[PDB]
Ligand SMILES: O=c1ccn([C@@H]2O[C@H](COP(=O)(O)OP(=O)(O)O)[C@@H](O)[C@H]2O)c(=O)[nH]1
Ligand SMILES: COC(=O)CCCCCCCCO[C@@H]1O[C@H](CO)[C@H](O)[C@H](O)[C@H]1O
Ligand SMILES: [Cl-]
Ligand SMILES: [Hg+2]
Ligand SMILES: [Hg+2]
Ligand SMILES: [Hg+2]
Ligand SMILES: [Hg+2]
Ligand SMILES: [Hg+2]
């Protein structure tokens with residue numbers, strides 16, 4: 001469907017978006033930083049498609065305590081204006097807090113899937129011991145995306161904590177690797193996310209049988225997958241930070257999703 005008339009600042013071809021950071025990967029995938037996108041145009045594009053975003057989180061044992069802040073802040077900053085379906089996987093259904101949600105947003109509690117394919121267009125998978133502090137919207141939606149780990153975004157590949165043992169399916173040699181993605185925030189279309197989760201599950205089963213466990217578990221496999229299946233968008237550390245441990249550097253114009261102290 002055609003976009004309606006819109007009035008906004010004209011993009012300037014001879015004026016770089018950001019001159020301090022890389023905003024596009026070598027395989028032409030945008031790296032999402034504040035200043036690279038006009039959210040009004042993007043909101044229009046995704047709303048015209050009546051986009052539904054599923055947000056999945058696991059809250060087991062004492063982690064159910066993080067749900068209230070997580071959901072409350074998600075209501076203020078996550079995909080506001082769009083259809084959102086929260087999926088909370090927990091071992092304590094009765095412990096899930098009663099959070100008030102805006103219109104067009106719902107929450108499903110699953111006690112511990114084709115359902116995802118028929119319910120949402122995109123799946124966003126994150127850790128629950130976090131809080132949203134600023135805008136996290138449709139600028140992240142794409143077939144497959146990963147997020148730059150805050151501890152290695154400025155490091156050389158040799159420093160990346162990839163699994164280095166050739167006996168592991170998550171193995172990545174010192175001369176390979178684009179970025180080190182953190183397992184705490186990834187997503188994409190339901191189809192691509194299920195392909196990724198299926199691939200990692202099978203790879204971890206193989207390691208299990210071979211008597212080996214990847215150095216950083218699921219994250220090690222996530223990195224191996226994204227190395228071989230390039231993400232169509234990469235999120236900057238604005239999307240995964242810890243102000244207490246890492247402060248607020250100039251390169252980050254916004255701190256959007258952070259660890260809870
Ligand atoms: O006993 C646990 C351990 C982990 N988690 C989930 O797994 C995520 C990632 O593990 P964790 O946050 O403990 O380590 P980090 O990922 O912070 O290194 C947690 O945020 C929770 O979402 C959980 O629900 N119960
Ligand atoms: C849960 O809170 C967050 O995700 C915010 C960012 C935390 C940044 C932590 C930086 C220090 C290292 O963290 C560890 O890094 C290894 C890989 O080297 C793994 O990713 C661990 O899960 C992570 O805790
Ligand atoms: Cl998840
Ligand atoms: Hg720009
Ligand atoms: Hg997920
Ligand atoms: Hg997750
Ligand atoms: Hg994998
Ligand atoms: Hg897995």
Ligand SMILES: [Hg+2]
Pocket residue numbers: 196197200201218219221222225
């Ligand atoms: Hg994975």
Ligand SMILES: [Mn+2]
Pocket residue numbers: 127128129184
């Ligand atoms: Mn965490």
